């Protein structure tokens, strides 16, 4: 009934939505991952159509 | 003999290449990309195994109810054991004769 993990998760989500870093995040890595995911989705759609 | 071992090595290499292609596809589509397209070919490699399955499906299947290759043909093996035993007996007799000759001196 202590629920310390719930409080830690709430604090991590409420401080900066990540609890570590505000402007030094992985936004560029996230964009690269999104581009890679779009390319993989296009390749998978082509493979399915083939 | 030759063809059976060749087909076995071919199936083993096919399985190894399928596992390697799956690992490469996982490593590529996991994190970072046009090379991921070749990852789809990995799935095609899986289809190759299916063909091998078909190759195993429409294989010989001589009886499919019993075991083929009747007889171990080890009669030749038994004959070879007898030949080696005769060679050992001859070696023993020769050693006895040699001991007798050395004692004669």
UniProtKB/Swiss-Prot annotation, chain A:
Q: Which family does it belong to?
A: Belongs to the Mediator complex subunit 8 family.
Q: Which gene encodes it?
A: Med8
Q: What is the protein's name according to its record?
A: Mediator of RNA polymerase II transcription subunit 8
Which residues of the full-length protein are shown here? Answer: 112 to 161 of 268
What sections of the sequence does the record tag as coiled-coil? Answer: 22-50
Record the organism. Mus musculus (Mouse)
* Function field: Component of the Mediator complex, a coactivator involved in the regulated transcription of nearly all RNA polymerase II-dependent genes. Mediator functions as a bridge to convey information from gene-specific regulatory proteins to the basal RNA polymerase II transcription machinery. Mediator is recruited to promoters by direct interactions with regulatory proteins and serves as a scaffold for the assembly of a functional preinitiation complex with RNA polymerase II and the general transcription factors.
> Region Interaction with the Elongin BC complex: start and end of each range?
31-40
The subcellular location is: Nucleus
Q: Specify the superkingdom.
A: Eukaryota
| The protein's assembly and partners | Component of the Mediator complex, which is composed of MED1, MED4, MED6, MED7, MED8, MED9, MED10, MED11, MED12, MED13, MED13L, MED14, MED15, MED16, MED17, MED18, MED19, MED20, MED21, MED22, MED23, MED24, MED25, MED26, MED27, MED29, MED30, MED31, CCNC, CDK8 and CDC2L6/CDK11. The MED12, MED13, CCNC and CDK8 subunits form a distinct module termed the CDK8 module. Mediator containing the CDK8 module is less active than Mediator lacking this module in supporting transcriptional activation.
From Swiss-Prot, chain B:
Primary location recorded for the protein, binned into one broad class: nucleus
GO terms, molecular function: transcription coregulator activity; ubiquitin protein ligase activity
Tissue note: Expressed in cochlea.
Q: Name one GO cellular component term.
A: nucleoplasm
Pfam families given in the database record: Med11
One GO term under biological process is: RNA polymerase II preinitiation complex assembly
Localization, UniProt: Nucleus
Q: What are the protein's UniProt keywords?
A: Acetylation, Activator, Nucleus, Transcription, Transcription regulation
Organism superkingdom:
Eukaryota
Q: What does this protein do?
A: Component of the Mediator complex, a coactivator involved in the regulated transcription of nearly all RNA polymerase II-dependent genes. Mediator functions as a bridge to convey information from gene-specific regulatory proteins to the basal RNA polymerase II transcription machinery. Mediator is recruited to promoters by direct interactions with regulatory proteins and serves as a scaffold for the assembly of a functional pre-initiation complex with RNA polymerase II and the general transcription factors.
Complex and partners: Component of the Mediator complex, which is composed of MED1, MED4, MED6, MED7, MED8, MED9, MED10, MED11, MED12, MED13, MED13L, MED14, MED15, MED16, MED17, MED18, MED19, MED20, MED21, MED22, MED23, MED24, MED25, MED26, MED27, MED29, MED30, MED31, CCNC, CDK8 and CDC2L6/CDK11. The MED12, MED13, CCNC and CDK8 subunits form a distinct module termed the CDK8 module. Mediator containing the CDK8 module is less active than Mediator lacking this module in supporting transcriptional activation.
Q: Which family does the UniProt entry place this protein in?
A: Belongs to the Mediator complex subunit 11 family.
- What this protein is called in its record is Mediator of RNA polymerase II transcription subunit 11
């Amino acid at each position: 009934k202590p629920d310390p993990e719930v409080e830690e998760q709430e604090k991590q989500l409420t401080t900066d939505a990540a609890r570590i870093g505000a402007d030094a995040a992985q936004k560029q890595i996230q964009s690269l991952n999104k581009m890679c995911s779009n390319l993989l989705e296009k390749i998978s759609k082509e493979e399915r159509e083939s | 003999n030759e063809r059976l071992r060749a087909l076995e090595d071919i199936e083993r290499e096919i399985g190894a290449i399928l596992q390697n292609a799956g690992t490469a596809i996982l490593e590529l589509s996991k994190e970072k990309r046009l090379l991921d397209r070749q990852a789809a070919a990995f799935t095609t490699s899986v289809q190759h195994v299916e063909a091998e399955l078909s190759a195993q499906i429409r294989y010989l299947t001589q009886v499919a109810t019993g075991q083929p290759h009747e007889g171990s043909s080890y009669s030749s093996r038994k004959d070879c054991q007898m030949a080696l035993k005769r060679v050992d007996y001859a070696r023993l007799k020769i050693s006895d004769v040699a001991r007798t000759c050395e004692q004669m001196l």
